[PDB]
RNA sequence: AUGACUCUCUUAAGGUAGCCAAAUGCCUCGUCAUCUAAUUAGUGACGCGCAUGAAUGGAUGAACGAGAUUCCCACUGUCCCU
RNA sequence: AGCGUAUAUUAAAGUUGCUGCAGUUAAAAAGCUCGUAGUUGGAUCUUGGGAGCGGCCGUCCCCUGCUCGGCGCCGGCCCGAAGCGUUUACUUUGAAAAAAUUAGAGUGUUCAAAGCAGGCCGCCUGGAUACCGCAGCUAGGAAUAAUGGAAUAGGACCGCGGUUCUAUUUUGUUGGUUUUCGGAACUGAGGCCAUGAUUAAGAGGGACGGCCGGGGGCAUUCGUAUUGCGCCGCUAGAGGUGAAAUUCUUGGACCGGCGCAAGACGGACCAGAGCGAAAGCAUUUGCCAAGAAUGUUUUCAUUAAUCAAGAACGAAAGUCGGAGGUUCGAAGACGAUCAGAUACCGUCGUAGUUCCGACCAUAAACGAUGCCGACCGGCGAUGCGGCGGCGUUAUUCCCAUGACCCGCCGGGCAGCUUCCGGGAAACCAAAGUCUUUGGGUUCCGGGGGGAGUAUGGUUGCAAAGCUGAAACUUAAAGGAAUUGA
RNA sequence: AAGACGGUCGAACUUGACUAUCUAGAGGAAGUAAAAGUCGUAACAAGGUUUCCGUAGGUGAACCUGCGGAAGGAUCAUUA
């Protein structure tokens, strides 16, 4: 969340190599823009996207919903 | 560590065959065994069978014919087609007369000679011959 | 297979290609020292310039002196200890005729009984040794 | 930010005097110059003061060790030898 | 088997089929409560009062004779600990052995049964904040330990 | 050619590690290689060492030097010629 | 109407091994244990009917609801629309996927390779379909494999009582406001649900009970011998060897005695017995932390298994500075030996042998044999713990504790027997459950030399340790068993 | 329209280090292969002092001798 008016997230999912007829982890991380009326984010919150035009040079997201963590009430 | 159920007992029964006991006590049980279990005393492979509910899991004590050459499992479970299950019965049971591969479908647990008819591929266990 | 999980699949594929290079008619063919010793470069023939007829002596049981002769290249201008075949066709090549040398049958591995030696003849300028043998072709003055 | 890779306090001495010698000052000129818990009042503020004799600066209170540590080593064992022979002839 | 030697051993309690409460046993599920309460008040852990009550007061499982287990009725009111039970012990254990090694400098097992106790810990530790009993910037540092026996 | 080997006279033993035409080698401006258009010079090997050789110390080495010696880039009335 | 030679490449090779190989002795498993990334993870929640079809048997259809427009029925019910109803993977279908290549229909190019043409004495007919990984889009299924929800209740579902922002459903036209309802947001007191905690693994962690072991660390007491000295005998040889001699001796050597002194080592008891993570560990007492096993109707509740990087320990030699120097004993000096011996043996003897401090990291560091898990025969011993049972013996006075006697159960070191089975055999109850080829996971080999070399990087005071090639060189190295000599 | 400041964009040539592949060499040395070369026999049988591992020191040359291993040994064994 370190820059300012923008987050970083990770987004997990698997290949199938098919010689091996098995999966492998792969990552890819990607910034988001994280606008002030989500007063309240942290990190592992889940957060849901959608594609606009460039707001830089490496950003092409804007944040929709936080979805929270399990667990996180007190 | 015990990490996976099924292949305990499907050795355990085989290896009661082997030797040749009139029956056989498999320890942990679960639904996905008895539930085998059930499939090849549906073509009689196997007779009929008791599992006893102590409060932990349960101990099934099966009671063998000796038509069972072999039982065998399939690990991990791969993810199987309508087009690729060709390709492992035709590397995995002997003949073209006789086998069988057991599978998970979400239409239930049953022998390839009826996700044929039910037209569903799905998941893989083991097989009986 | 040994090492049977489900989404291993790179565990798996790692250890192959770390393997293969233990393999020889790969690594002989994976690294660049292959090409950089061997005289064609990368080639199925390659002609050159003769400068001396030699007699090689043949290794034990068998003995019988072997006829060779000692090329120049184009090329590379190397150096590399050749063979003729036949009977009696040393006669034909004269000291700094052209020749076109060939490969031997076996790959970078030698024939029989004459050591070091890994090349031989098919041409002496323009028409095959071959020829001259039987006499179908014979030579200009 | 690590300073010195190999040489204690003694690269207050540079190339000079060789490097074994150089070695050997490291195990003194770090031993001597420390601090220790005065054993009466429990702080920790032993120091010497020149050699073999040694000044708590809270209790005022002083001791004679050895020239460079506190306890001479087998001086730990000339006081556990002098009790038990207080053991072998009072009965 | 044992984790941290190679011992393959094997002995533990077998509970019983029926689970209802035996006959003799009067003591009622309101009643004994005031029990627990008391053997906690004592410096005791709950796996000890787990103990006392099964050889003088004859009980077959406390659970059974009320509905809930020993950590429940000490924890919830304001009489049972701040640490697991089992935390404690391994540091206490930890801070009788790292003490070892000052005056018997040379005593080399020691120090190899001293790098067990502490990837037990750390171990232990990991997993009680998954399960969010521990609050997660907690570490067991043997510099700070010996306060907390 | 060469000498791994073999004998034979002798003393208290008879020079073992290393290290050289040296701040130490007569013959000598020793000889192969390196730097120059040209080098009794300087440095890199060869040891036969008149008289090298181990706290009478042997072989090596970062820093250091108003210490002894060679060659290259800079710069100059030191020289051409005043 | 062709057929050889040379080099690239595939099949041959299950001689790269995902399908599918090896690793006791053929090439090969880190000296030991911990460890993060990686991979892998016990069981447990929806299961029985009623009808419908033909000959008890096999099929199909019935198992979350709360504004309009039609099936009309009578503001009540059935049915289509306007919007929605833990989230993934998996799976069946539906779009969307240029040609040419491939596969495949049709058609007599005179046959084929091929093409996209053709057929009926103006006209009839084709220019088909299939396959086109992964990723994304769409609708069904909900078995198998991942994530969630009600615990200091900040909980569901219901009704009742205010506050504050407020489009007009309403006061014919013009001033205004509560009227009246909906549409935000806060909040107090209540009634109600069967109100809400799966189980305690022949998985683990930890407690507690009486035990056991040459496990480790610090002091402490003993024992005879070997070597050095101090005296008291008597006397001539005493060492050594296959045989001699170097070496000691009337300067009293060797054997005999009574004393003292230090520097090693722990005999016999000692076993196919024991404990330790591996190296390893054997004189009596005192103390200090640890340990496996057994015992348990104690407690936690999946906390576990294997492990790139990184870490603790690591015989014997070898190093750096002290302390100590009896025996032995690399280097050296002699005596014998032999054609020659700078080797065996024999006489001395340094570094070293022993303590306290810190380096070093390898050995046939061995069972030449990965760790955790399931399973598959018979017996005779044995060690530790627990339980049952005749009878001798001890403490006499028997209570139970020790000693001897026959089994039962758990973990340990080994044996014997055998057509469980395997293998190339020797041999292995594991080296078994392997073309009847899949329980989870880590290291590693791919014909011989060259060669553990060169080089570079790394670690050390040093020797050396970890990593580690190439050119060239060759049809056999090699294994287990036969007969011979 | 010629031309002249200022600005950007900017080839090319000169000076330096960084990096890649090949290449000369006094002298020092490894390895490999070649029909009647020379000193000795360390190894295979209790190869005539058992063999081999690690590490240190010696020796014309195979190889020795010290200390701790292991049978891959010439003993599966030895008597209250």
Redesign the interface.
């Known amino acids: 969340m370190k820059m300012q008016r923008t987050i970083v997230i990770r987004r997990d999912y698997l290949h199938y190599i098919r010689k091996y007829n098995r999966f492998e982890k792969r990552h890819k991380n990607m910034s988001v823009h994280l606008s002030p009326c989500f007063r309240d984010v942290q990190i592992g919150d889940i957060v849901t996207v959608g594609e606009c035009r460039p707001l830089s040079k490496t950003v092409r997201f804007n944040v929709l919903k936080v979805t929270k963590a399990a667990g996180t009430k007190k | 560590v015990r990490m996976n159920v099924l292949a305990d007992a499907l050795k355990s029964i085989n290896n009661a065959e082997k030797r040749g006991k009139r029956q056989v006590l498999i320890r942990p049980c679960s639904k996905v065994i008895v539930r085998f279990l059930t499939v090849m005393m549906k073509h009689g492979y196997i007779g009929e069978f008791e599992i006893i509910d ?2 932990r899991a349960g101990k099934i004590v099966v009671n063998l014919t000796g038509r069972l050459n072999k039982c065998g499992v399939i ?2 479970r ?1 993810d199987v087609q309508l087009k690729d299950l060709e390709k492992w019965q035709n590397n995995l049971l002997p003949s073209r007369q006789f086998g069988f591969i057991v599978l998970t479908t979400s239409a239930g647990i049953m022998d390839h000679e009826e996700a044929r008819r039910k037209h569903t591929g799905g998941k893989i266990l083991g097989f009986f011959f | 297979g040994k090492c049977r999980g489900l989404r291993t699949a790179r565990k798996l594929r790692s250890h192959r290609r770390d393997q293969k290079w233990h393999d020889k008619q790969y690594k002989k063919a994976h690294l660049g020292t292959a090409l950089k010793a061997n005289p064609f470069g990368g080639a199925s023939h390659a002609k050159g310039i003769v400068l001396e007829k030699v007699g090689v002596e043949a290794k034990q049981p068998n003995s019988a002196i072997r006829k060779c002769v000692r090329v120049q290249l184009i090329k590379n201008g190397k150096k590399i200890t050749a063979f003729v075949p036949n009977d009696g066709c040393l006669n034909f090549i004269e000291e700094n005729d052209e020749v076109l040398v060939a490969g031997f049958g076996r790959k970078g591995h030698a024939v029989g009984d004459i050591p070091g030696v890994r090349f031989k003849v098919v041409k002496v300028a323009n028409v095959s040794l071959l020829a001259l043998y039987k006499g179908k072709k014979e030579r200009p003055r | 930010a690590k300073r010195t890779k190999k040489v204690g306090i003694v690269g207050k001495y540079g190339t000079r005097y060789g490097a074994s010698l150089r070695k050997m000052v490291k195990k003194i000129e770090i031993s001597q110059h420390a601090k220790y818990t005065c054993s009466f009042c429990g702080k920790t503020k032993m120091k010497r003061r020149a050699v073999g004799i040694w000044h708590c600066g809270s209790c005022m209170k002083t001791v004679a060790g050895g020239a460079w540590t506190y306890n001479t080593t087998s001086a730990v064992t000339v006081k556990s030898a002098i009790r038990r022979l207080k053991e072998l002839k009072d009965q | 088997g044992r984790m941290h030697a190679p011992g393959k051993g094997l002995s533990q309690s077998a509970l019983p089929y029926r689970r209802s409460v035996p006959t003799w046993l009067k003591l009622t599920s309101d009643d004994v409560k005031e029990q627990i309460y008391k053997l906690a008040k004592k410096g005791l852990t709950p796996s000890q009062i787990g103990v006392i009550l099964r050889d003088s007061h004859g009980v077959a499982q406390v659970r059974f004779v009320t509905g809930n287990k020993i950590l429940r009725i000490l924890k919830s009111k304001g009489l049972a600990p701040d640490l697991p039970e089992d935390l404690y012990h391994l540091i206490k254990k930890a801070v009788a052995v790292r003490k070892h090694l000052e005056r018997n400098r040379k005593d080399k097992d020691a120090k190899f049964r001293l790098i067990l106790i502490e990837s037990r810990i750390h171990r232990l530790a990991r997993y009680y904040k998954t399960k969010r009993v521990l609050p997660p910037n907690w570490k067991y540092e043997s510099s700070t330990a010996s306060a907390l026996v």
């Open positions: 102590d409060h690990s991990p791969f």
